[PDB]
């Protein structure tokens, strides 16, 4: 992988970044809003403020030509783009040339490098590392933290959370530069890498619910229907409310061996079967039972923040903040709270869908979210369907979402192009993927939409 | 000129510091750090909250 060539983009990109706060500059951070994003916005933080240096960070959803344009509208010293900006290269020395530019990055670049000197790009894939196993985004950040002080080791498990979050150990264990990263973890004892079942809800989780989530690896007859694993644990003597964390160590050895040979019997894929017990990560940093003392609950948190536009929020968890904890806890149970009630005016409210030829029209009005469109639809299925609801960010404009089974997809029914060819018509964003996508148009074309939508299909 | 990190929750245009800086501008939900004599301002009318980085 050569990676004394890597390590020397890592020392030119941390040198920048150590030169500008010796200079007093402001370090303008820029990274994605997910587990790998948050954390590498938050190693990237802790190194400059480690420093002394001052540090403005934004979580954004990606990189868009829009999001250049007033980023250099800024004009700012230097610019550091962490889990982001491989992809725009061209882009980024384009608009950005006036000042210094460092991308952290592991996704495939469009070029091995910058072609002006003051821009650095740290990417471990043009020196041969494969992105989805070698090193993550937040993995990259530690790389180059690490190289501006030692001190920055202390940020391992946070780069871990970020790498689990990109599913790096997707094969069951770490591979590449990220077992320095567990390496360096394990020195300081701030991260322990066990042998247990990879599932998540090892902290936070019921059994009969990590079991009911299972995914990578699926479980057969369990994973989906909630009820069969509460059937299924109680037969082989375990309690389905009890959570895995609370399990002793002859517990859980047991409730390997009996998950591996229910797999054996119903057919379950070899590869599948090989990723059910393999590398989990915890911290004795928190508490066992909490949802940062496991990495895969951790970047499950992380992703929920993100998600809910508050990704700084995050970050600050990943700094150490606990009133930010605290915050967005409060934050999912209000989220889930909106939940049980959006899927209960559906129930409530069946009695106000518009009948269609190919499709379902529900519109909620203000009652729903623009959010909680998207599970509204599932919900009402689990009991085409399109939901719609008024805009909070806007007035004049109705989101919706569009779900669907197998069924339908198999004879046609395909709906990202049928939503984004109304959309076009209705002068409006749309499209998505095929059995689930998103759309926005004016509010006062809804009975238009219905209409449109049904003759696409 | 002490400082210390908030995150920003509301539009902030640039404003000047106490140390001759410039710090912002600010979009919503953004995290930086600042004079606290202009961060404490911010968090008393609720336009930003303190997060602590422990070093």
Redesign the interface.
Known sequence: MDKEAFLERVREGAELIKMHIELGHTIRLISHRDADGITAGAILAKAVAREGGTFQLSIVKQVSEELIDQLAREKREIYVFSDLGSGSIELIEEKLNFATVVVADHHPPEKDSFSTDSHVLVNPVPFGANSVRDLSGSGVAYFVAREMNRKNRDMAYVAIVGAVGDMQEIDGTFHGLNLEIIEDGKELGILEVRKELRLFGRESRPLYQMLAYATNPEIPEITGDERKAIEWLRAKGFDPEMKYWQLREEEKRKLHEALLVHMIKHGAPKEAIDRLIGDVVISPLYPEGDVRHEAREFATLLNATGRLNAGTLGVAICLGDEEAYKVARKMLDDYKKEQIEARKFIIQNWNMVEEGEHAYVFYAGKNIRDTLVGIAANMAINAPVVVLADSDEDENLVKGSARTTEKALEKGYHLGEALKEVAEKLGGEGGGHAIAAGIRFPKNRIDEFIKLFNEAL | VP?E?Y?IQIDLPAVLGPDM?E?????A??????PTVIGRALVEREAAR??????
Do not use: E, Q, S
């Open positions: 400082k990190a995150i800086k710090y912002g501008p600010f979009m939900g953004d995290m930086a750090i600042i303190r997060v602590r980085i422990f070093l």
